[PDB]
Amino acid sequence: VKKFPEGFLWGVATASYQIEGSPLADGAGMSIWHTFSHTPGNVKNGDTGDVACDHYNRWKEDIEIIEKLGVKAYRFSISWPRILPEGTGRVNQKGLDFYNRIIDTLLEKGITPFVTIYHWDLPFALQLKGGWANREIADWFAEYSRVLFENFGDRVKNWITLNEPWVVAIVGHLYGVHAPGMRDIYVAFRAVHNLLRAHARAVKVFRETVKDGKIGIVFNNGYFEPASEKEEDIRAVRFMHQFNNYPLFLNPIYRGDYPELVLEFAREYLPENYKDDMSEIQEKIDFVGLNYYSGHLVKFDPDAPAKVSFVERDLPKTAMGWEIVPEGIYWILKKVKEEYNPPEVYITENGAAFDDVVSEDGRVHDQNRIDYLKAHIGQAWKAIQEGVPLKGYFVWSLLDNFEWAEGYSKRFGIVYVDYSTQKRIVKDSGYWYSNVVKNNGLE
Ligand SMILES: N=[N+]=NCCCCNC(=O)[C@@H]1[C@H]2[C@H](O)[C@@H](O)[C@H](O)[C@@H](CO)[C@@H]12
Ligand SMILES: [Cl-]
Ligand SMILES: [Cl-]
């Protein structure tokens, strides 16, 4: 038996573009994901978020799935261009009406909402003016954040500013694989900096607008291990963890500068007087959300950019090709405790894509996702026993959804979605997870 502490929060998560559909309904502006996904070559099979799971219409059913399973929290995101179609200015009252209903229904069913302000659907109008690359995004971001705090902050007490600013900056502006689809390292390191400026302004504004709330920020994390015991590979790891994981952002938030290795690689790519913004950046946060999926073996390589390369291993992998290493989640949780000692941590997303099929019985037998989930939950349990202040754990995702540049070829849900019909079927992992929730852990 591995029983979690009293009042531990068991959650599921989603993001707005991945599940809602109806991106230009009821007054909404275009986002950078509507434009990107409508560009040929960007997304496998030419999928887009145009219909998705049609949550825009099916929300009440989907809430009803959460309640029926007895899951107690629900992290979802808010689409900025549904709220402000031009990014700033006139409010789209029908965008508010969409989220108010959701939120009211969660509250009447006893489900604690956790709201992500930004999970990648930047308004297109703001992209035309530089998007994340423009220092003025901090002000666009605060204006937008305040509309949300003012309209929902009476009922929503648990807030996340950014989902995975590493991904927004680096995948969106250096690799060019996510919206806005750009490949320029100098812009990329501007976006990193500006996401920090933006976060910190929203938290400021949070303190002036919400009573009795908590506000945090979410980071992607991988478990980097070294390829040999060479000090060069052990240093490859130190760089990967500083660059790709939470420190890239927590060194500034808790220390007042970028991490050391990061600065060795990149000082030239960051704005001139970047350090002048650091004081404002240390606006006090209430928690750290960690997202965790996979592990990577890493070596020093001088040919490679940033002098590091990945090394394939023969471990089980998911449909994404992600090596499954459940002790990574224990390690990231001990390390964030040891490094920056935040007063509260959540696991804001953990889960896995496998090629789910429906059987002749009309069920989805996904023991592969149960195995994955059990091993990670057991590992998180162990981190709590060792003193990590882990307050909750959210499964990515409630529903099969639009998996970014992968389209609908990758199914991460605990609820199967037939896209022909929009039928929801609860997977075996959904039923399992429901009993984890009931028993407050593993049995
Ligand atoms: N090198 N490197 N890092 C690249 C991998 C970073 C992890 N982030 C993501 O892929 C997105 C994040 C998002 O919250 C969610 O909307 C996505 O559905 C999941 C993907 O299943 C994860
Ligand atoms: Cl528009
Ligand atoms: Cl600028």
From Swiss-Prot:
Gene Ontology MF terms in the entry? beta-glucosidase activity
- GO BP term, example: cellulose catabolic process
**Domain of life the protein comes from:** Bacteria
Keyword terms, alphabetized: Carbohydrate metabolism, Cellulose degradation, Glycosidase, Hydrolase, Polysaccharide degradation
Q: Which reaction does it catalyse?
A: Hydrolysis of terminal, non-reducing beta-D-glucosyl residues with release of beta-D-glucose
Catalytic positions are: 164 (proton donor), 349 (nucleophile)
Pathway it belongs to? Glycan metabolism; cellulose degradation
Q: What class of enzyme is it?
A: hydrolase
> EC annotation?
3.2.1.21
The record's section on PROSITE patterns has: GLYCOSYL_HYDROL_F1_1, GLYCOSYL_HYDROL_F1_2
PANTHER family in the cross-refs: GLYCOSYL HYDROLASE (PTHR10353), LP05116P (PTHR10353:SF36)
Similarity comment text for this entry: Belongs to the glycosyl hydrolase 1 family.
| Name used for this protein in its record | Beta-glucosidase A
Q: Which organism is it from?
A: Thermotoga maritima (strain ATCC 43589 / DSM 3109 / JCM 10099 / NBRC 100826 / MSB8)
Lineage summary: Bacteria, Thermotogati, Thermotogota, Thermotogae, Thermotogales
Gene of this entry? bglA
